[PDB]
Amino acid sequence: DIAAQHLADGIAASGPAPDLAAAAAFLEMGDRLGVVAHLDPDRTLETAEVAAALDLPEPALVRYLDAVESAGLVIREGEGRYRACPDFDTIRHQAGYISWTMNANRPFIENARDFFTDWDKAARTHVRDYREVAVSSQWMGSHAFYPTALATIIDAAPRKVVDLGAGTCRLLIEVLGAVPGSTGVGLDFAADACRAAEQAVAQAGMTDRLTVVERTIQSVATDPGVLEGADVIHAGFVFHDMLPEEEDVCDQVLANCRESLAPGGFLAITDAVPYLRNDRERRFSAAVSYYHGEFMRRRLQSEEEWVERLRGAGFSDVRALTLAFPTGRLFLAHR
């Protein structure tokens, strides 16, 4: 009788945490192996072929997939064939938040004492794995920021679209595929990301429309030529890296963005605003804010600071839109 009461009380106390904890660990483990990229609710993963492609022993891969099937994350369709559960993309999205705070930002969790005593020594010793930062933020973005930026670029029907920090040019290839007769300039300093975006642009069929330029966003303050005539300039979570050290460079990048825009054009920036108080956003906002401010020393600006800076760059009007990503804001700065 007492065991039944403790059972109902404990289920209410645990809530959704055991499911989320299990999903995040299985998905991070599978992503590091390269397995999660082959999991999709509309098609099967064939173990014989995937084990060869990923260079894993097939028995070990089958035991991983059988544990993930027992968890309810995949369905065994036939022998050696597994399909993701129908709500897989939502589970992967939620796992993104746990991976970001517990995996991508792990050096900060484990070595906080070092950061509090000698920040400069700690900042160069305990560094984040950039592949984990990239995958976890892509998972968070899938349902919480990427579709708002995507629908905003597309519905403006642009002739030219520029992406500052384009990465693998996924947003640029999707906007070009939906807007008939549009060109795009993908800007990213990484040679590894640019070479991957170059091959992805060719297979999509837009090698003449999409120009990949291996350059830093800070180089746009000196050379804004590639921005000229753009209808939409996109910048997703790339400006706070410059603040507060490269403040004047960042201000020049924004001023160049405004002058370069074609009539009716806009600069669409998505960024994180610091320490919100509202109940829905406050907890994740505080984690994003503390990791940026305390551990990375990157300046996050409020909506008011952002609007003032964007008006100081010549922009006539600035609109702020709340994103589902807690503490995330989309600023549309009209020329």
Ligand X SMILES: CC(C)CC(=O)C(=O)O
Q: Name which of 100 and 266 has its Cβ closer to a second copy.
A: 100
Q: If you write DSSP's letter for every residue of 166-186 in order, what string do you get?
A: -TT-HHHHHHHHHSTT-EEEE
**Least separation in angstroms between CB 321 and a second copy:** 5
194 binds, among a second copy, ligand X, none (CB under 5 to 8 A by kind): none
| 325 labeled part of a ligand binding site | no
| 1 labeled part of a ligand binding site | no
Please pick, from the candidates 114, 198, 237, 262, the single residue that binds ligand X as defined by CB under 6 A. Answer: 237
Stretch that binds ligand X, among 17-25, 86-94, 133-141, 248-256 (CB under 6 A): 133-141
- Residue numbers 287-326 binding ligand X by CB under 6 A: 288
Q: How far apart are CA 79 and CA 64, in angstroms?
A: 14
Stretch that binds ligand X, among 25-33, 88-96, 132-140, 162-170 (CB under 6 A): 132-140
133 binds, among a second copy, ligand X, none (CB under 5 to 8 A by kind): ligand X
Where do runs of H (alpha helix) occur along the chain?
2-14, 17-33, 47-54, 58-70, 88-99, 106-110, 112-117, 119-125, 130-144, 146-155, 170-178, 191-204, 247-260, 282-290, 303-312
Q: Does 189 bind ligand X (CB under 6 A)?
A: no
Site string for ligand X, 78-107 (x = CB under 6 A): --------------------------x---
Q: Does 272 bind ligand X (CB under 6 A)?
A: yes
Q: How far apart are CA 266 and CA 153, in angstroms?
A: 10
How far, in Å, are 64, 248, 332 from residue 271 at the CA level? 37, 18, 11
What 3-state DSSP class applies to 223? coil
Q: Name which of 189 and 275 has its Cβ closer to a second copy.
A: 275
Here the tokens at position 320 are 């702020």
Q: Name which of 103 and 183 has its Cβ closer to a second copy.
A: 103
Pairing of strands 232-236, 44-46: unpaired
Collect all residues with Cβ–Cβ distance below 8 Å to 66 and sequence separation of at least 6.
Answer: 76
Let me know: does 27 contact 72? Beta carbons within 8 Å.
no
Q: How far apart are CA 57 and CA 217, in angstroms?
A: 43
Q: Name which of 115 and 315 has its Cβ closer to ligand X.
A: 115
Q: How far apart are CA 145 and CA 269, in angstroms?
A: 11
137 binds, among a second copy, ligand X, none (CB under 5 to 8 A by kind): ligand X
**100: exposed, middle or buried (C-beta count within 10 Å: 0-12, 13-18, 19+)?**
buried
| 10 labeled part of a ligand binding site | no
| 9 labeled part of a ligand binding site | no
143 binds, among ligand X, a second copy, none (CB under 5 to 8 A by kind): a second copy
**Least separation in angstroms between CB 7 and a second copy:** 5
Q: Does 133 bind ligand X (CB under 6 A)?
A: yes
93 binds, among a second copy, ligand X, none (CB under 5 to 8 A by kind): a second copy
**94: exposed, middle or buried (C-beta count within 10 Å: 0-12, 13-18, 19+)?**
buried
Binding positions for ligand X, rule: CB under 6 A = 104, 133, 137, 140, 237, 272, 288
| Bind-site residues for Zn(2+) | 240-241, 292
